[PDB]
Structures are given as C-alpha cells and as structure tokens.
Amino acid sequence: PTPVEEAQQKTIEAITKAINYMAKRRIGALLTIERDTGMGDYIETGIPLNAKVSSELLINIFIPNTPLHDGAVIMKNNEIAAAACYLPLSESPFISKELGTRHRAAVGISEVTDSLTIIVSEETGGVSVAKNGDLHRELTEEALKEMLEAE
Amino acid sequence: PTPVEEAQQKTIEAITKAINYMAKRRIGALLTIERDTGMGDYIETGIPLNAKVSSELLINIFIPNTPLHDGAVIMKNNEIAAAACYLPLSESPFISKELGTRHRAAVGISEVTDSLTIIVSEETGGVSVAKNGDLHRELTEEALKEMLEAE
Ligand SMILES: COCCc1nnc(N)o1
Ligand SMILES: [Mg+2]
C-alpha cells in the first residue's frame, strides 16, 4: 500500500470509530466527505479547522450544546476542513417524513455534488448515507465501512 | 497593523473568549503556548490537530468527559498543534495546597520551558497562568489579556 492508500485507511478508521460511538450514544451528526466536486462555497460558511482527522475530534465536534455541533462537518481528503457548515436542504419526497434537518441537508448537498454524507440520528441512533440524491438508512457498521472503502 | 500583528490579536481574542466561557461554566482547561523552547516531545504525546485556532474549537476540545479534554492543548505557530497532551507535574512545594494536577502540570511545564500556560479551575472557574515556575492566580480578564499581549 502506498502512503496515500494508508492515509485513506486511517481516515476511514477514524470516521467509522467516531460514527459508531455517536450512533451508540444517539449523538446527532452530519459529516460530508468532499469528492471530486469542490465544496469550497459550503466549507466557507463554517468555522475553519483545517485539522488532522481523528475519531476524538470528530466526536467532540458533535457533542450536543457545544459551539461546533450544529451544521455539517466537511472533510477534504485527510482533513476536517470546517465544522458547523451550511448545506442546502433537499425537497426530495423520498426522505422519510419523520427525519429532520440533518438528513434533508445531507440529501441536499448530495444532489449538487458527488460527495458522500454520513448522518447519525439523534432520535434513533441510526446511521444513514446520502449520495447522488438518495438516502440509504439503517446501515450496519460493516455496510458503512464498505461504502467508505468503495468511495 | 501588519498581517502578523492582526493574526496574533485574533488568536488572543479567540483564547480569551474560550477561557471566559470555560471560567463561567467551571470547565477545567489546560492550554500551553509554546514559545522559544521547543515542545515537540510533549506535542507528540497528544492527539494531533494542527488546526486553526478558534474559540469554538477550544471550547469543543475541553468539554468534560469527552475524548480530548484529558490533558493539555499545546499551541505552536498560531495553531492548535495537539490536544490531550502530557505535561510534567511540578514538585514545587510553593503551589497553593488546594490546587490539583492541572495546575501542577502547568507549573511543571513552566519550570522547563519559556512557555505560557493558562489554567481554568474546575472547582472555582478561576483563571491562572503558569510561567517561569510560578502560578499567577485569580486573574481578571484584563490581567490575562495583558499577559498574552506581553508574551
Ligand atoms: C474514549 O472515549 C470513547 C470514545 C470517544 N472519543 N472521544 C469521545 N468524546 O469519546
Ligand atoms: Mg434497510
């Protein structure tokens, strides 16, 4: 494996550890991974971090009632670019009616970028992904990790 | 002001805002600013961040019972280098006997470096600074700002 490949594997491990922990605790989270469509316009709406990824930092960002927890984290490769970012809300009718703004924001950004967004529900602890305008819900840990590896 | 001056002032403002928030809520915190003595060996004991400073990120690091709040934040070159770092405990017999490990850690690093460390007490919300082996206690907001600007 090249350094680039090993760095990706470390980032994927950090993300999955954070998501799994938040899911167990019903910590709502919204995490968008930029791909080939640049997300600068959305990154610039948040608080700049440009931080090395760690599971610890991801979890801390989303603790309720803290400055960084509302809005999206946007990751660029192996960095957390910004937190508390705006994303556009989707009007798709295929978003389950009980879901709130984090899921609608995730699907929204997925309609205008090739990004992958992970959502943790504060109601249920369920994990979902938005990509290309579709929301895939109730993901097992294994499924999430495979989706990230394939991404 | 020059660019470097504006950047230093912005960092001081971020620090003081975070410290004020933590003092009000009696959130324990430990924040060491590296100066001429290199602290890489201590930075390496924590979780790497290399992040832009913001009051928001500082607060989100120090949330009680979260991954990153156990240990010191170390700042270097106008960035948060790492969190949850080890600092050496002072053996000085001249620290107020009611103070515990965060304050002893701050004094300890200040005995072997020219760094400036800020401490917020979880017991009282009092703010103190360690430099040169001494602890300056019960600081007002103006006092802490003066110390940061002098530094
Ligand atoms: C070690 O703690 C369990 C996982 C965790 N990491 N960071 C937070 N806040 O939790
Ligand atoms: Mg299903």
Author numbering:
A (entry chain B), B (entry chain A): 102 to 252
Please quote the paper that reports this structure.
The enzyme CdaA, which synthesizes an essential second messenger cyclic di-AMP (c-di-AMP) in many pathogenic bacteria, has emerged as a promising candidate for the development of novel antibiotics. Additionally, c-di-AMP regulates the bacterial stringent response, further underscoring its significance. The synthesis of c-di-AMP is mediated by enzymes possessing a diadenylate-cyclase (DAC) domain.
Consequently, we selected B. subtilis CdaA for the fragment-screening campaign due to the excellent diffraction properties, high reproducibility and quality of BsCdaA crystals. Notably, these crystals tolerated up to 20% DMSO in the reservoir solution, which facilitates soaking experiments. A crystallographic fragment screen of BsCdaA utilizing the F2X-Entry Screen resulted in a 33% hit rate, identifying 24 distinct fragments interacting with BsCdaA across eight sites.
